[PDB]
Design a protein around this ligand. Structure first.
Ligand SMILES: CCN(CC)c1ccc2c(c1)Oc1cc(N(CC)CC)ccc1C2c1ccccc1C(=O)OCCOCCn1cc(CO[C@@H]2O[C@@H](C)[C@@H](O)[C@@H](O)[C@@H]2O)nn1
Ligand SMILES: CCN(CC)c1ccc2c(c1)Oc1cc(N(CC)CC)ccc1C2c1ccccc1C(=O)OCCOCCn1cc(CO[C@@H]2O[C@@H](C)[C@@H](O)[C@@H](O)[C@@H]2O)nn1
Ligand SMILES: CCN(CC)c1ccc2c(c1)Oc1cc(N(CC)CC)ccc1C2c1ccccc1C(=O)OCCOCCn1cc(CO[C@@H]2O[C@@H](C)[C@@H](O)[C@@H](O)[C@@H]2O)nn1
Length: 259
């Protein structure tokens, strides 16, 4: 019943792009510092995930649009939207490096599996674990990636950790999740939409706890960015066809201009 969203951000402006799947069509809204507007992206799909990276100041966007079991990758490289080489379900994606490496996690029929890009083609990764819902975040430590995948069946969410030596279960404690991370520590915020309500758990480096965020919504996507050492987070909560943007900028959650 709800609409499904995915969101990505970049820069110290920042620019934001929000992709919304509604009745089988994905559309896009965009922020460049002074107001929202309708973006150029428009392609069919029932669920959506997104990641993006910068090479210098040039943004590259990848939108993963799922229908049935088929996911179609869409590519922004500064020159229109074009179909990617990637080959119902629900996806989560993350990327790192200037290469880039991509990893796309697909919840299909209760199992989550992984497809990876490393510059020379798509291949099936080692991640294979139960779940009805997936979200993902990652960070670099210099040049080594660390990945956390949040896998949900029922109301139970299991964190999976990749840290250079195989997957292991993390200590984090079908609902729908979204995740973001920042720093080298790192900090993590995970948001969960369950029975019409979105709540938040957070990692310091030292134990999980419940965050302050609590708003209605059957579907959540998030994005975040750093200005110096201050984190700025945007959470997009959807009920029916309405999406509200809540904003963390260091002092409580303010209502955003998103429409
Ligand atoms: C920093 C500047 N950038 C980055 C934007 C750049 C650099 C080099 C090229 C660039 C662009 O573009 C091309 C384009 C072509 N064409 C255009 C008609 C023919 C295909 C030819 C050479 C260059 C080349 C190129 C020139 C000389 C020698 C080699 C290449 C090359 O690697 O080649 C790059 C393309 O082919 C080989 C490597 N590659 C890159 C990709 C990108 O794939 C997409 O992006 C990935 C991240 C995934 O999402 C994937 O699923 C998706 O399809 N696929 N294959
Ligand atoms: C006091 C300031 N802090 C801040 C956390 C701190 C810093 C370093 C350590 C600290 C604590 O504790 C230990 C403890 C040990 N022991 C004795 C108790 C061995 C059993 C040994 C070395 C240090 C180390 C340590 C010492 C020297 C060199 C490295 C480390 C280290 O790797 O530190 C790594 C950071 O550990 C902090 C606590 N932590 C981190 C995690 C990682 O958790 C995973 O990853 C997270 C991102 C989440 O996804 C989480 O859900 C998931 O399970 N689990 N516990
Ligand atoms: C948080 C406290 N408030 C109340 C609105 C506030 C906020 C911003 C300013 C404020 C005061 O004062 C100034 C003053 C100056 N001057 C003149 C004296 C020079 C020193 C210059 C800038 C600011 C700005 C300013 C800073 C950054 C971006 C825009 C503005 C602005 O002028 O716009 C006012 C904010 O609302 C108008 C529209 N808007 C909103 C945003 C940020 O909003 C959020 O953040 C975005 C990233 C998106 O997520 C968006 O959907 C979400 O609503 N940026 N523009």
């Amino acid at each position: 019943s709800s609409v499904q969203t995915a969101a990505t951000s970049w820069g110290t402006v920042p620019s934001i792009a929000v992709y919304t799947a509604n009745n089988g069509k994905i559309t896009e809204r965009c922020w460049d510092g002074k107001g929202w507007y309708t973006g150029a992206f428009n392609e069919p799909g029932d669920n959506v995930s997104v990641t993006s990276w910068l090479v210098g100041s040039a943004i590259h966007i990848r939108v993963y649009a799922s229908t049935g079991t088929t996911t179609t990758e869409w590519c922004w490289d500064g020159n229109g939207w074009t179909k990617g080489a990637y080959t119902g379900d629900q996806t989560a994606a993350t990327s790192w490096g200037t290469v880039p490496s991509i990893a796309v996690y697909t919840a299909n029929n209760g199992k989550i599996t992984e497809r990876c890009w490393d510059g020379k083609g798509w291949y099936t990764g080692a991640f294979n674990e139960p779940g009805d819902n997936v979200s993902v975040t990652s960070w670099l430590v210099g040049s080594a990636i660390h990945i956390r995948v949040y896998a949900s069946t029922g109301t139970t969410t299991t964190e999976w950790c990749w840290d250079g030596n195989g997957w292991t279960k993390g200590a984090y404690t079908g609902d729908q999740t979204a995740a973001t991370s920042w720093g080298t520590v790192p900090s993590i915020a995970v948001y969960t939409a369950n029975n019409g309500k979105i709540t938040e758990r957070c990692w310091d480096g030292k134990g999980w706890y419940t965050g302050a965020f609590n708003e209605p919504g059957d579907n959540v996507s998030v994005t975040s960015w750093l200005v110096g050492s201050a984190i700025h987070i945007r959470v997009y909560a959807s009920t029916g066809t309405t999406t509200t943007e809540w904003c963390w900028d260091g002092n409580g959650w303010t209502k955003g201009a998103y429409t």
